[PDB]
Every structure is written in C-alpha cells, then in structure tokens.
C-alpha cells in the first residue's frame, strides 16, 4: 500500500534523526566508557547485578534495524546506560562519574530531539 510506504518514509526520517542524536550522544563520552558491552569474560557477575544491560554499540544495531518506533524508545535505551552503570559502580569512581557527566550533557540534546520530533511528527 502507498499508506505502509508512506510510514516506512517516516520510520526512515526518525531513524536518520535518532542516528543524529546518538552520535551527538556519543560525542559526551570522550573516554569511550558506554561504548561498547560490559565484557562478560571480564566481569563474570555483571548479569548478578544488572539485568538489562546496555551500551552504544547495542544502540547503533537496534537503530540501523529501524527497531525505534518513537523517541521515547531511544531514551529508555539511553537512560539504562546511565542507570546501569550508577548502581554497578559507586560514586567515587570514573564510571560513576562518566555517566553523570553524560546524563547532564546528554539533557540538552535530548530536550531538542524532543521538540524536533513533535515538530515534524
């Protein structure tokens, strides 16, 4: 139908808006500390502690499959990056440190993509 293509133009317009934000997202974390997954051969407990894991990398395959329906989505994803790492690692440490970082950072990039998405539907 010209209706399912027409959605499927759509899909592609928020995935080329989320694939934006995520590389502005990603530009806040210079160390490179939410790249890429929590090695498993490296922290054998981390599925002890937390059960959803999550990380850019993990981000960039879900995006690129069009597997983001809405925003909303795209920063629950975000969001257990930073969550995930506050609760694994404590306060006094650069991990800890890094996400708030992140999170402060990411806020403003975040709050745009929001009106750009109501704004152009």
Request: aromatic share 8%; with cysteine.
């Amino acid at each position: 139908s010209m209706e399912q293509v027409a959605m499927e133009l759509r899909l592609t317009e928020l995935t080329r808006l989320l694939r934006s934000v995520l590389d502005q997202l990603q530009d806040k974390d210079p160390a490179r500390i939410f790249a890429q997954p929590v090695s498993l051969k490296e922290v054998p407990d981390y599925l002890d502690h937390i059960k959803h894991p999550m990380d850019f990398a993990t981000m960039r395959k879900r995006l690129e499959a069009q597997g983001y329906k809405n925003l909303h989505e795209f920063e629950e994803d975000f969001d257990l990056i930073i969550d995930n790492c506050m609760k694994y690692n404590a306060r006094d440490t650069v991990f800890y440190r890094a996400a708030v970082r992140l999170r402060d950072q990411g806020g403003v990039v975040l709050r745009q993509a929001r009106r750009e998405v109501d704004s152009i539907g």
